[PDB]
């Protein structure tokens, strides 16, 4: 029953084209609402809501504080980018792919073909489906990217189809951790 | 290339609990354990390639608590409105019998960052092999969290994720079984 | 490699 009070501070570094263009943001929040913000383009603090005007006027009066935040694209952003570069921006983990039908049932009945892609990093991945060698872009549904919270993603790309005898459905996965595409086939059978 | 590194911090009253963590493209690099005053890396291998001085994090958490007391008064003690969480339970791999798997309980879109997550195996609380994450930040400035239960897929075993939050009138129970 | 810490600007008073 005791009322709570939350302060949040988020020092954000945004990188484009590696470190060729960097933007720094010094964001101060009260109850999930941004009150005052320093941005490496404006060069000083600004108040997003009126309730953070006193802090912006105060920090903008001190050149020592401003020269500290103006420098943070170089002494903080590009610095911490280089510290973790080898195991973050260059991290490559390949996924395990598994293809399985959603229902054990006869052919010529409607079915849903699941291509499960588990454990890749980074998130950039392309997943395709092939019916007898022809890519099929209709009837595809994806869960999107699922973060497992451990520096791996997963995703399920499902295919709606009516399976027929002799059909070979192929899931194809493309990912930076792999020099060649990953393919897993499913036999329709009888 | 396009990435986002975020150094995210918070302080909560009157709970007097703080958190300091780094975030890369949505993933936690490390957090500072306020109790032990030590850097805790999300993946143990990370500490072999980099280090971090926990006392600089503690400096900021002292600043944030003074910053919060000023802002609470400035707002005439405007409290935070609780937000209940969304709970989704899943596995990190397709389920096969006698093939080891991990249950993931995903708590999302909530605030303030205080929860009670309890794994249950057939109604029985399980406290062996469980692990969890700290509160991870969101771009809408809510929080998220992961809890993990490694298990052996069975036909007679049943699991539940029990999440208690102030935004909930009743403890939220999300279910899982071998037949999803 | 040592990670840096961006400081939080102190509120007046």
């Amino acid at each position, epitope marked *: 029953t005791r009322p709570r009070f939350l302060e949040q501070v988020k020092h954000e570094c945004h990188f484009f084209n590696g470190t060729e263009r960097v933007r720094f943001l010094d964001r101060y929040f009260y109850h999930q609402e941004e009150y005052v913000r320093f941005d490496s383009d404006v060069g000083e603090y600004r108040a997003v809501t009126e309730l953070g005007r006193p802090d912006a006027e105060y*920090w903008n009066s*001190q050149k*020592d*504080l401003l*020269e*500290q935040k103006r*420098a*943070a694209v*170089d*002494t*903080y952003c590009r*610095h911490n980018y280089g510290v973790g570069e080898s195991f973050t921006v260059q991290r490559r983990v390949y996924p395990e792919v598994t293809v399985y039908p959603a229902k054990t049932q006869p052919l010529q009945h409607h079915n849903l073909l699941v291509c499960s892609v588990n454990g890749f990093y980074p998130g950039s991945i392309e997943v395709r489906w092939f019916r007898n060698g022809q890519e099929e872009k209709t009837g595809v549904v994806s869960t999107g990217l699922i973060q497992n919270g451990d520096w791996t993603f997963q995703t399920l790309v499902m295919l709606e189809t009516v399976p027929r005898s002799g059909e070979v459905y192929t899931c194809q996965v493309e990912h930076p951790s792999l020099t060649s595409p990953l393919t897993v086939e499913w036999r329709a059978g009888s | 290339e396009e990435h986002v590194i975020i150094q995210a911090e918070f302080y909560l009253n009157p709970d007097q609990s703080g958190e300091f963590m780094f975030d890369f493209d949505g993933d936690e690099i490390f957090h500072v354990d306020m109790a032990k005053k030590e850097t805790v890396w999300r993946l143990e291998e990370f500490g072999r390639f980099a280090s*971090f*001085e926990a*006392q*600089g994090a503690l*400096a*900021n958490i002292a*600043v944030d608590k*003074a910053n919060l007391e000023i802002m609470t008064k400035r707002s005439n003690y405007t409290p935070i409105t609780n937000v209940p969480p969304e709970v989704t339970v899943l596995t990190n791999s397709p389920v096969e019998l006698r093939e080891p798997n991990v249950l993931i309980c995903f708590i999302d879109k909530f605030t303030p960052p205080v929860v009670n997550v309890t794994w249950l195996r057939n109604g029985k609380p399980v406290t062996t092999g469980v692990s969890e994450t700290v509160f991870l930040p969101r771009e809408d400035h809510l929080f998220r969290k992961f809890h993990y239960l490694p298990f052996l897929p069975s036909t007679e075993d049943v699991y539940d994720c029990r999440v208690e939050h102030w935004g909930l009138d009743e403890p939220l129970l999300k279910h899982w079984e071998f037949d999803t | 490699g*040592v*990670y*840096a*810490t*961006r*400081s*939080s*600007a*102190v509120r007046l008073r």
Partner: T-cell receptor, first 115, second 115 residues
Framework: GGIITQTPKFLIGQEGQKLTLKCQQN?????MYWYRQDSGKGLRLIYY???????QKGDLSEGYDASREKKSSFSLTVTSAQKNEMAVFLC?????????????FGSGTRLLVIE | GDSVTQTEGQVTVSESKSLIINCTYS????????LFWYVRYPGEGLQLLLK?????QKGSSRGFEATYNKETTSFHLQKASVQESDSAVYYC????????????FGSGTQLTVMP
């Protein structure tokens, strides 16, 4: 017109005596410091106090005790001048902005202990 | 080891002649250092003279200049033509960009410029 003054400028003491040094500043600086410049070399921090709570660091183990009730006054005492030491004590203060604010120093107190 | 070392003792130069006061630094816990020069004129306290917070940048004040050099891990103080009013003690100090680490001062180099 800012000033930071420590008293006394010169202070001779005997062994085991409890010698108190006082420093006050009118800069509205939240944090104050107490350094010890010894005959040889090196400034060495004995005590610093960010706002209203000190933090022993650097040179307490030599036997000191600080106190600070007002934002403007930082008091240093030598628990037991032992013995025949010769040292300058410098008082500093700085603004707590979160940035590296410039230190403002005092002239110094010359302490001399004799038998 | 998180420290600073500079020229030991005293340096004597002639008026209107070049001066160079070496300084270097080491680091273990400070992630991104900031570098400072402090001056103490005779019968006064230390005050800030120069200050550089960014890799490879040069700071200049009162005819002096120092370059934060990360390749040589130095911050040497230089001046083309010293005046008689520059006779003082110069200190090299080391902090962190966060502002959370107390300044690490050097031993101090004493400069006396003869007329």
């Amino acid at each position: 017109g800012g000033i930071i003054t420590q008293t006394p400028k010169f202070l001779i003491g005997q062994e085991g005596q409890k010698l108190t040094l006082k420093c006050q500043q009118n800069f509205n600086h939240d944090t104050m410091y107490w350094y010890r410049q010894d005959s040889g070399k090196g400034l060495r921090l004995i005590y610093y106090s960010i706002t209203e709570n000190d933090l022993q660091k650097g040179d307490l183990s030599e036997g000191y005790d600080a106190s600070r009730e007002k934002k403007s006054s930082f008091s240093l005492t030598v628990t037991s001048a032992q013995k025949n030491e010769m040292a300058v004590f410098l008082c500093a203060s700085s603004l707590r902005t979160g940035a590296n604010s410039d230190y403002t120093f005092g002239s110094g107190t010359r302490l001399l202990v004799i038998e | 080891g998180d420290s600073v070392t500079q020229t030991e003792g005293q340096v004597t130069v002639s008026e209107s002649k070049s001066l160079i006061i070496n300084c270097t630094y080491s680091t273990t816990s400070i992630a991104y250092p900031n570098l400072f020069w402090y001056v103490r004129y005779p019968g006064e306290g230390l005050q800030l003279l120069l200050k550089v917070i960014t890799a490879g940048q040069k700071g200049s004040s009162r005819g002096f200049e120092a370059t934060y050099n990360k390749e040589t891990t130095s911050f040497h103080l230089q001046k083309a033509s010293v005046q008689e009013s520059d006779s003082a003690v110069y200190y090299c100090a080391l902090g962190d960009h966060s502002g959370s680490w107390q300044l690490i001062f050097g031993s101090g180099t004493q400069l006396t410029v003869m007329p």
